[PDB]
Structure 1
Amino acid sequence: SSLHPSIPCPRGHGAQKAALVLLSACLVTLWGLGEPPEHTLRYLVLHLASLQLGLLLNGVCSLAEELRHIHSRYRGSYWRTVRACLGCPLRRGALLLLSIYFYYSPFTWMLALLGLSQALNILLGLKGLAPAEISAVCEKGNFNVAHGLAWSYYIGYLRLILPELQARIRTYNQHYNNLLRGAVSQRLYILLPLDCGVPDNLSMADPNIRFLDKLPQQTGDRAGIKDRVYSNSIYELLENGQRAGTCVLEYATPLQTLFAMSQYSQAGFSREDRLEQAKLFCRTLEDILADAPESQNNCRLIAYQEPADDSSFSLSQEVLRHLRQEE
């Protein structure tokens, strides 16, 4: 919500307010018309009971599938299989009895009609979920690709190199770097292009940044591999032909993974998905770094969207703009 105005905000409570207004208008309209309220009570109860019976029939129809994978998904219990499909059995049974008692007061004819309607819905696929209705059920439950990618990035990279970053910078400044050249600042800078176009060579896309030197590497043992290696680099920020400063630059590799996923046919990843996924990845990474012990005191996030008209946009300008708040 601060990285870029294009990043969305989490969903709120507009639906409940609209539902309340609709309920109030419906109640006022019912009061305006002349009728006793007992009919309203009876019809409302009957409608709710019919809805419950429809849900139960759908659950029984769906149970014909989940009983083929019992020994693989539900261990070996018939009681967990019915829990996955039919919510919570005890509440469902209580609602069953209440609905049957309130609906029995001809009658067997309507059960057949509900059966036909439910079977038609299952077969012909009349019922379904809108694109903005499955996008709000997988956001509260964390069923995203970018959620996993951001947590992987944090755990595997930033929880590892961030604590020991300043020691390497200090050693490079004293032991190796000469005093005549300018010192490299702290706070590793992460660039997050909200386009997933990550160039392999950073010298491209801007002639004003050139590769200067490297950093001492760090090693560790991870997942049965001895002496994994981590490395970084230092770049030069030319200002109108002369140097203006130095920094430590990186893109975000999961953006490259998203871009490469969007082109293979087997991935099943649309070209409209990997923009919302990039913005969601940026939001989640910012939230994770907000309250981590190795907080933004050691890294800064930069998000930019490439203008279509090329309005004299250069990466170096934005990088210097962000560098100028350090002091």
Structure 2
Amino acid sequence: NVAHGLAWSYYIGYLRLILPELQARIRTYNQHYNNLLRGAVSQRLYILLPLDCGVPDNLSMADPNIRFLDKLPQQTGDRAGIKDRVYSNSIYELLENGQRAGTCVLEYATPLQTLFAMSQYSQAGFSREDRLEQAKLFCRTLEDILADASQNNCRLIAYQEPSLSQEVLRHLRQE
């Protein structure tokens, strides 16, 4: 349904174009930019997928143990008539007991914001109960696309709320 189009839009528009050349940007930050004494940013992009489609624009305000650190070197590309459309990513540190536990490239999945707004607009004909299924369908289709296509550059983090920093840390430790 709606999520299926959004999922393919996510892969074709964003993931297919920045994942193949994301590792080099992380290398460039770690070697040439990252502080000489602060470890290394992980090699994988971690994507948050709140199934309730609550996607705040500020990750740091969504968890005090998460806070912005730096940005990777931005990726530019001529896209659909725009000269040097800029694809940017933000590096975040994760705090356990007040000490930096992990640093990675972390962001939410924007199409989930699109689903949430459509449920809020009268003309979209989208319901709140419809949204929760589309949120799940969006992740499934995204998983199917990434299964058979770059690889090992993207880890999906889905969660439903009855610590987000502990949730993300939990994924970093597994690899």
Partner SS, residue 138 of structure 2: helix
Q: Which has a greater percent of helix?
A: 1
CA distance in 2, matches of 1:211, 1:159: 25
Looking at structure 2, the residues matched to 268 and 163 of structure 1 have their Cα atoms a distance apart, in angstroms, of: 37
Q: Residues of 1 paired with 2:35 and 2:93: CA distance?
A: 15
User: How many angstroms apart in 1 are the aligned matches of 2:90 and 2:120?
Assistant: 30
| Residue 174 of structure 1, CA deviation | 1.1
**Structure 1 partner of 2:161:** 306
Q: Counterparts of 2:94 and 2:28 in 1: how far apart (Å)?
A: 22
Secondary structure (helix, strand or coil) at the match of 1:316 reads helix
Q: Can you list the C-alpha shifts for 1:150-192, whole angstroms capped at 9, x where unaligned?
A: 1111000011000100111111111112321111111100010
CA shift digits 1:229-266 (9 cap, x unpaired): 11001001111111111111011111000000001111
Distance in 2 between the 1:269 and 1:256 partners?
13
Deviation at 1:200, TM superposition (A): 1.4
Q: Distance in 2 between matches of 1:300 and 1:235?
A: 15
Q: CA deviation at 1:279?
A: 0.4
Which has the greater radius of gyration? 1
How many pairs does the alignment contain?
175
In 2, the alpha carbon distance for the partners of 1:322 and 1:176 equals 25
Structure with the larger RCO, 1 or 2 (CA within 8 Å, 6+ apart): 2
Specify the alignment match of 2:29 in structure 1. Answer: 172
Unaligned runs of 5+ in 1: 1-143, 308-313
Distance 1:222 1:206 in 2: 34
Helix, strand or coil at the partner of 2:47: strand
Q: TM-score, structure 1 length as denominator?
A: 0.52
2: CA distance between counterparts of 1:176 and 1:302? Answer: 27
Structure with a larger share of its residues in strand: 2
Measure, in 1, the Cα distance between the counterparts of 2:81 and 2:166: 44
Separation in 2, partners of 1:207, 1:296: 31
Runs of 4+ in structure 1 displaced over 4 angstroms?
A: none
What SS does structure 2 have at the residue aligned with 1:261? helix
**SS where residue 235 of structure 1 aligns?**
strand
1:315 aligns with 2:171: no
Question: How far is 1:204 from its partner?
Answer: 1.6
**C-alpha distance in 2, partners of 1:321/1:168?**
24
Q: Secondary structure at the match of 2:120?
A: coil
Offset of 1:218 from its aligned partner? 1.4
Task: Tell me the distance in 2 between the aligned counterparts of 1:164 and 1:211.
Answer: 22
Structure 2: segments with no counterpart, 5+ residues? none
**Distance of 1:183 and 1:280 partners within structure 2:** 34
Alpha-carbon displacement from aligned partner over 1:112-135 (angstroms, at most 9, x marks no partner): xxxxxxxxxxxxxxxxxxxxxxxx
Q: What SS does structure 2 have at the residue aligned with 1:204? A: helix
Name the Cα RMSD after superposition. Answer: 1.0
- Following superposition, the deviation at residue 284 of structure 1 comes to 0.3
- Residue 280 of structure 1: CA displacement? 0.5
Encode CA deviations 1:185-222: one digit per residue, 9 max, x unaligned: 11100010000110111112211111111111111111
Q: Distance in 1 between matches of 2:35 and 2:49?
A: 32
Q: Deviations over 1:93-150 (max 9, x none)?
A: xxxxxxxxxxxxxxxxxxxxxxxxxxxxxxxxxxxxxxxxxxxxxxxxxxx1111111
Q: TM-score, normalised by structure 2?
A: 0.97
